[PDB]
């Protein structure tokens, strides 16, 4: 009987046969996984809940809990940062790209949860008159090979929970 008491929690395990089948069905087209005993996997969550001017993101704590635990289940050490300006986010991202553990890691997860407009992710000090935005382009530049050589050739997964404008995203059609 599988058990969520283990370190992987509610995440379904990959059997030794499954791992061997995947390593055969797909050739040398899989990202190399580092030795479990010695790998220092890192993940970062930047979540903004309290904002100066824009409404409070009620429920964000449930998102932090779930994402933090999931990345841990997957093997990542999770750094949780809260209520940051676009400037703080940049500083924190820079700090993340400078972590020595990336040298002895095989992958990384970046998670941004905040309000958002068309142009990017909202800092805590965001308003219409004085925008506080982090561009998706900026995240990429900071984690790329120039600014983060430690993560060269390694999957970098970026996850964003945010609006991207005011529209409901739907059109009507008749059957």
């Amino acid at each position: 009987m599988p058990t969520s008491s283990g370190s992987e929690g509610n995440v379904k395990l990959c059997s030794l046969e499954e791992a061997q089948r995947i390593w055969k069905q797909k050739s040398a087209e899989i990202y190399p996984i580092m030795d479990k005993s010695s790998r220092t996997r890192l993940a970062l969550i930047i979540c903004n809940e309290e904002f100066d001017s824009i409404p409070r993101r009620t429920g964000a704590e449930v998102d932090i809990t779930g994402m933090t635990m999931l990345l841990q289940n997957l093997g990542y050490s999770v750094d949780v940062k809260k209520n940051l300006t676009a400037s703080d986010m940049t500083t924190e991202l820079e700090a993340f790209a400078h972590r020595p553990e990336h040298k002895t890691s095989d992958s990384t997860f970046l998670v941004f949860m905040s309000h958002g407009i068309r142009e990017g992710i909202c800092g805590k000090k965001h308003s219409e008159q004085v925008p506080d935005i982090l561009q998706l382009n900026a995240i990429f530049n900071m984690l790329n090979t120039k600014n983060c050589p430690s993560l060269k050739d390694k999957p970098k997964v970026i996850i964003i929970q945010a609006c991207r404008g005011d529209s409901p995203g739907v059109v009507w059609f008749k059957d």
């Binding site: 990959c14 990202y31 996984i33 429920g59 779930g66 999957p155 970098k156 996850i159 404008g165 995203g169």
Partner: protein, 88 residues
């Protein structure tokens, strides 16, 4: 000896909605996208690469209700499949 490397490679972004559009959130249940992603990671991490999983999340949003959104994969430079191999 110095060698050349691509400045940008092995990236995958996953957004909660398509450009111009909102993403929904429950005050006690969290974000709809985040919750769905945790579900799909939990179920599929062991059998699919992360790109596949993201598609399945997308597919799970295919039928729109009153609060519709369509998660988007962006700026993909993965040259390989990324399997999480949970348990390893």
């Amino acid at each position: 000896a110095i060698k050349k490397a691509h400045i940008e490679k092995d990236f995958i972004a996953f957004c909660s909605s398509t450009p111009d559009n909102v993403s929904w959130r429950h005050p006690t249940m969290g974000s709809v996208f985040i919750g769905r992603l945790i579900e799909h990671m939990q179920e599929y991490a062991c059998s699919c690469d992360v790109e596949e999983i993201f598609r399945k999340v997308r597919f799970s949003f295919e039928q729109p209700d009153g609060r519709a959104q369509m998660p988007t994969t962006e700026r993909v430079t993965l040259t390989r499949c990324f399997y999480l191999f949970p348990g390893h």
